[PDB]
């Protein structure tokens, strides 16, 4: 019922079919802005 | 917006620059109008928030990181357009995708 980052889940490598959003956890020395700028995402087929 | 903020003044303190106005308008109307995905909108917002503060025009501002090992593209300290274009012409010929914030292996 109820830092962190939100990463998309895509059906393929084209990143044109979003499935759902996943809330992971970040390490101590990393940065969410760098995570967003580097285009980190999750795929389903690769 | 600069003409609205400055009533013909010669200089503005960087705190008085409409940073929030510029960021919101550019992320929602000009560049964000074409943006479809919420993640693309988030990336555009991150870029605008990182770039349109500069610690209020402070020196030694980090525009990007060219190489992960001891290399940064520091902000030029010029004030004039000629100084800025001279800094632009000084950029090295080799460009890695880490200039864009992308990984070098892209």
UniProtKB/Swiss-Prot annotation, chain B:
Write out the annotated subcellular location.
Cytoplasm, Cytoskeleton
Residues with the N6-acetyllysine modification = 62
Instruction: Give the protein's biological function.
Output: Cytoplasmic dynein 1 acts as a motor for the intracellular retrograde motility of vesicles and organelles along microtubules. Dynein has ATPase activity; the force-producing power stroke is thought to occur on release of ADP. Plays a role in mitotic spindle assembly and metaphase plate congression.
Q: How does it assemble?
A: Homodimer. The cytoplasmic dynein 1 complex consists of two catalytic heavy chains (HCs) and a number of non-catalytic subunits presented by intermediate chains (ICs), light intermediate chains (LICs) and light chains (LCs); the composition seems to vary in respect to the IC, LIC and LC composition. The heavy chain homodimer serves as a scaffold for the probable homodimeric assembly of the respective non-catalytic subunits. The ICs and LICs bind directly to the HC dimer and dynein LCs assemble on the IC dimer. Interacts with DYNC1LI1; DYNC1LI1 and DYNC1LI2 bind mutually exclusive to DYNC1H1.
Q: Which illness does the annotation name? A: Charcot-Marie-Tooth disease, axonal, type 2O: An axonal form of Charcot-Marie-Tooth disease, a disorder of the peripheral nervous system, characterized by progressive weakness and atrophy, initially of the peroneal muscles and later of the distal muscles of the arms. Charcot-Marie-Tooth disease is classified in two main groups on the basis of electrophysiologic properties and histopathology: primary peripheral demyelinating neuropathies (designated CMT1 when they are dominantly inherited) and primary peripheral axonal neuropathies (CMT2). Cortical dysplasia, complex, with other brain malformations 13: An autosomal dominant disorder characterized by global developmental delay with impaired intellectual development. Some patients show signs of peripheral neuropathy, such as abnormal gait and hyporeflexia. CDCBM13 is associated with variable neuronal migration defects resulting in cortical malformations.
Comment text on domains? Dynein heavy chains probably consist of an N-terminal stem (which binds cargo and interacts with other dynein components), and the head or motor domain. The motor contains six tandemly-linked AAA domains in the head, which form a ring. A stalk-like structure (formed by two of the coiled coil domains) protrudes between AAA 4 and AAA 5 and terminates in a microtubule-binding site. A seventh domain may also contribute to this ring; it is not clear whether the N-terminus or the C-terminus forms this extra domain.
Q: Which family does it belong to?
A: Belongs to the dynein heavy chain family.
Q: What protein name does the entry list?
A: Cytoplasmic dynein 1 heavy chain 1
